[PDB]
């Protein structure tokens, strides 16, 4: 199905993933999520990725998926974990910020079995009404220098 904008939660297990992603405009995900994001990319004007570190209580920003997984793109940049991921794809971060799940109140996701937004696993899609607002709220905050003090 075609659509204009779709929105996916991305979880990061180590902060260095986010720092590498910001420095080089790149991401990779599990093989199943890679297929899901690739299918969205070719049928949707904009695929937005909303980044949330495992260890954090919220989002560190959001970006646009710019290209499909490409085995030639930054091969092995994540280290040996590359062996259990799909191929790398380009991402343009549109905002670096700090927004806590708790700042949003107790939001649940009807496209994820009524789970709290804060319990979203990697690759969880959110409905556009919620995804658009999350991105709007992130954009309206001061940018956070995520790489400061790292």
Ligand X SMILES: CNc1ncnc2c1ncn2C
Question: Using CB under 6 A as the criterion, which residues of the chain lie in contact with ligand X when the complex forms?
Answer: 13, 17, 28-30, 78, 81, 85, 122
- Smallest gap from residue 85 Cβ to ligand X (A): 6
Q: Which is nearer to ligand X, 34 or 109 (CB)?
A: 34
- Smallest gap from residue 4 Cβ to ligand X (A): 26
CA–CA distance, 98 with 56 (Å, rounded to integer): 10
Q: Which is nearer to ligand X, 17 or 60 (CB)?
A: 17
Q: Which is nearer to ligand X, 39 or 139 (CB)?
A: 39
- For residue 10, the tally of other CB atoms under 10 A from its CB is 27
DSSP assignment of 25-69 = TEE---HHHHHHHHHHHHHEEEEEEEEEETTSSEEEEEEEE-S--
Yes or no: say if 71 and 30 are a contact pair by the CB < 8 Å rule: no
- Smallest gap from residue 106 Cβ to ligand X (A): 26
Task: Give the length of the chain.
Answer: 150
Q: Which is nearer to ligand X, 39 or 140 (CB)?
A: 39
- Smallest gap from residue 140 Cβ to ligand X (A): 27
């Amino acid at each position: 199905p075609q659509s204009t904008k779709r929105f996916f939660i991305i979880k990061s297990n180590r902060m260095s993933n986010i720092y590498t992603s910001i420095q080089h405009g790149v991401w990779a995900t599990s093989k199943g999520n890679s297929r899901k994001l690739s299918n969205a990319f070719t049928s949707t004007d904009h695929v937005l990725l909303l980044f949330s570190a495992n260890e954090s209580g919220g989002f560190q920003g959001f970006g646009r998926m710019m290209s499909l997984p490409d085995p030639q793109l930054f091969p092995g940049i994540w280290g040996p974990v590359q062996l259990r991921l799909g191929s790398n794809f380009r991402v343009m971060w549109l905002k670096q910020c700090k927004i806590e799940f708790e700042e949003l109140g107790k939001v649940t996701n009807p496209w994820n079995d009524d789970l709290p937004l804060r319990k979203s696993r990697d690759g969880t899609e959110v409905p556009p009404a919620l995804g658009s607002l999350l991105c709007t709220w992130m954009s309206q905050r001061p940018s956070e220098d995520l790489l400061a003090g790292t």
